């Protein structure tokens, strides 16, 4: 729970809780996602945000997720101490980037890593806008000046166009609804719930024999508190790959589209 | 994260996480419920468990029968909350687990909980009366004198809960658990039932009142592939009667009561 020596990144340690683990006695993908969100919120708070800046609050602007990419090598067990390091970076006028590094506190080894793309949006009109110079200045003094990427790769999985799932979907999970636990302090559906909804259409047999290694997820539209989501999946592929689609049950309005990679246990 | 000086209770501190808070910027009832479960699991682990040597041999496990939680002040995001838990025996009826919620800064009691646990065979799901051999290995970790978080004889935690009669005033149907709701043994987490109970409370009541008390009976377990209907009726401060039942046959899984205060 502290900024690093240069104040250009934040570090936090977590002990994995009993209710945070799944069938394999290891932290669920949603627990990891929540832990990334927690270390990110505290980083924004430790430098004077609320993650809006002074100019963003004046112009009724907020940061919204556009893409999420998480890769796990080892899921921490119940009781294990995991340490996460996060940092923000500017992507010119497209928006901002937030990266994460997951580590084992005992061995120091990197057991996972994440990256997210954030676009600026007017709170009310919901219209995405390009980042102005005045706002870009207010967050550049908290970002590393040299590019520091959790996924440095010359042609990585985090920056690839995701196709649209064509009907009929191989697998599906219908009538998914958020509850009050899924909503945040601003009554909006938590970004992590969409990850959990995406994986609900993965069959229970794949979950019992494989471990989720990678998950890329695009956030096309928000699901309202009183909305109902349909989760769709199709095997595309020792490794399994799937195409995903979250859409509103009625009109079929797309809210999310993603991909997952799984490996044998 | 340590047993107290006498080793007859466990204490643990928690910093309230950003995703654990609701609209009012304070910890949700399910976050508190999860924090009670966490401190309870660690207490069982710190003493060698929550099944025991003879319980494993007989294919026996502890199941919740009743939950009673009272909150006076919900902790804010960033606040440090300290919980103290302890186990006690209830003859051969079962076991009891109590909790005390406190503010780490002021030391004030901001909440308290109590739960009744029944002995069940994991396979046949039959309730077994607790034997003398298992009560001996459980008594060495319990206070010998009765220590009750709700000492009031015949209070809100020990009262018969009636069955909600149709038509329910409010309802929330088609509730389903996801993988996040299942525990390491693939069973639906006890806290999900609390959240499902409160889903039938209207959004207007939540926006103007705070949940002060919640008593909840656990009649039957909801399977991974099951669908629940949540029912509520105002009986009254606001009071409600609750009923969780399976969507199809209407099989009762839970019944409870909630008390709310104006903000
Ligand atoms: C400054 C706040 N940062 C975030 O909210 N980060 C995340 C991470 C995930 C996952 O969802 N939100
Ligand atoms: C020894 C394990 N104790 C519990 O599981 N306690 C709880 C508390 C709540 C709530 O649900 N389970």
Mark the breaks in chain A: residue after which each occurs, C to N over 2.5 Å.
50, 237
Q: What is the distance in angstroms between the Cα of A201 and the nearest Cα belonging to chain B? A: 10
Query: Does the Cβ of B194 fall within 6 Å of ligand 2?
Result: no
Chain B residue numbers with beta carbons less than 8 Å from the beta carbon of A197 are 178
Q: Give me the resolution in angstroms, 1 decimal.
A: 2.9
Chain B residue numbers with beta carbons less than 8 Å from the beta carbon of A34 are 17, 19
Which of A181, A189, A195, A262 to mutate against chain B (most B CBs within 10 Å)?
Answer: A181
CA distance B80 to B242: 32
CA of B16 to the centre of ligand 2 (A): 19
CATH class, range B170-262: alpha beta
* Positions of CATH 3.10.129.10 in chain A: 2-158, 171-264
- B57 in Cβ contact with A42 (< 8 Å): no
Q: Which ligand is nearest to the CA of A184?
A: 1
Give me the catalytic one of B187, B189, B190, B209.
Answer: B187
Rounded (10°) CA dihedral B181, B241, A189, B224: 20
Nearest CA to ligand 1 atom 4: A37
Report the CATH architecture of A2-158.
Roll (3.10)
Nearest CA to ligand 2 atom 10: B33
- A193 in Cβ contact with A229 (< 8 Å): no
Cross-strand partners of A219: A256
Q: Count Cβ neighbours within 10 Å for each residue of B95-123 and write b for 16 or more, e otherwise.
A: bbbbbbbbbeeeeeebbbbbbbbbbbeee
CATH of A171-264, one of 2.60.40.420, 3.40.190.80, 3.10.129.10, 3.20.20.70: 3.10.129.10
Chain B residue numbers with beta carbons less than 8 Å from the beta carbon of A183 are 22-23
- B10 in Cβ contact with B85 (< 8 Å): yes
Residues 6+ apart with CB under 8 A from B163: B243, B252, B255
Residue in B21, B30, B180 nearest the CB of A28: B180
Place of tokens 């959240």: B195
Q: How far apart are the first and last CA of chain B?
A: 33
* Positions of CATH 3.10.129.10 in chain B: 2-139, 170-262
Catalytic annotation present for B185: yes
Place of tokens 């219209």: A127
Helix and strand numbers, DSSP H then E, in chain B: 5, 12
- Name the burial class of residue B132, with classes exposed (0-12), middle (13-18) and buried (19+) by CB atoms within 10 angstroms of its CB: exposed
Which residues have any ligand 1 atom within 6 Å of their CB? A 33, 36-37, 40-41, 44, 51, 68, 98, 116, 191-192
Report the CATH architecture of B2-139.
Roll (3.10)
Catalytic annotation present for B187: yes
DSSP string, chain A: -EE-TTSSSEEEEEEPPGGGB-TTSBB-HHHHHHHHHHHHHHHHHHTT-----HHHHHTTEEEEEEEEEEEESSPPBTT-EEEEEEEEEEETTTEEEEEEEEEETTT--EEEEEEEEEEEEETTT--EEPPPHHHHHHHHTTS-SS---SS--TT-GGGSPPPPPPSSPSEEEEEE---GGGB-TTSPBPHHHHHHHHGGGS-HHHHHHEEEEEEEEEE-SPPPTT--EEEEEEE---EEEEEEEEEETTT--EEEEEEEEEEE-
Q: How far apart are the first and last CA of chain A?
A: 33
Tokens of B56: 């494993």
Query: Does the Cβ of B32 fall within 6 Å of ligand 2?
Result: no
Tokens of A246: 């979250």
Catalytic annotation present for A60: no
Tokens of A93: 């006028």
- B221 in Cβ contact with B185 (< 8 Å): no
- A262 in Cβ contact with A208 (< 8 Å): no
Residue in B21, B30, B186 nearest the CB of A185: B21
Give me the catalytic one of A188, A190, A191, A256.
Answer: A188
DSSP three-state, residue B97: strand
DSSP state of B199: G
Q: Which ligand is nearest to the CA of B64?
A: 2
User: Strand locations in B164-237, DSSP E?
Assistant: 170-175, 209-218, 228-234
Residue B103: in which H helix or E strand, if any?
Answer: strand B94-103
Atom of ligand 2 nearest to the CA of B67: 10
């Amino acid at each position: 729970g502290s900024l690093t020596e240069d104040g250009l990144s934040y570090k936090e340690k977590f002990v994995v809780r009993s209710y945070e683990v799944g069938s394999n006695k290891t932290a669920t993908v949603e627990t990891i996602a929540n832990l990334l969100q927690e270390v990110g919120c505290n980083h924004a708070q430790s430098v004077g945000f609320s993650a809006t800046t002074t100019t963003m609050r004046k112009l009724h602007l907020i940061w919204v997720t556009a893409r999420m990419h998480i890769e796990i090598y080892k899921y921490p067990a119940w009781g294990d101490v995991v340490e996460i390091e996060t940092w923000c970076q500017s992507e010119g006028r497209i928006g901002t980037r937030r990266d994460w590094i997951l580590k084992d506190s005992v061995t120091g080894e990197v057991t996972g890593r994440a990256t997210s793309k954030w676009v600026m949006m007017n709170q009310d009109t919901r219209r995405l806008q390009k980042v102005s110079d005045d706002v870009r200045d207010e967050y550049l003094v908290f970002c590393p000046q040299e590019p520091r990427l959790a996924f440095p790769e010359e042609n990585n999985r985090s920056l690839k166009k995701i196709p649209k799932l064509e009907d009929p979907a191989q697998y599906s999970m219908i009538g998914l609804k958020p509850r009050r636990a899924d909503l945040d302090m601003n009554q909006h559906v938590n970004n992590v719930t969409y990850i959990g909804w995406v994986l609900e259409s993965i069959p229970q047999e794949i979950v019992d024999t494989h471990e989720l290694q990678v998950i890329t997820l695009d956030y096309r539209r928000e699901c309202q508190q009183d909305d109902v989501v349909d989760s769709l999946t199709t095997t595309t592929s020792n490794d399994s790959q799937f195409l995903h689609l979250l859409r509103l049950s009625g009109d079929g309005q797309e809210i999310n589209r993603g991909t997952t990679l799984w490996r044998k246990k």
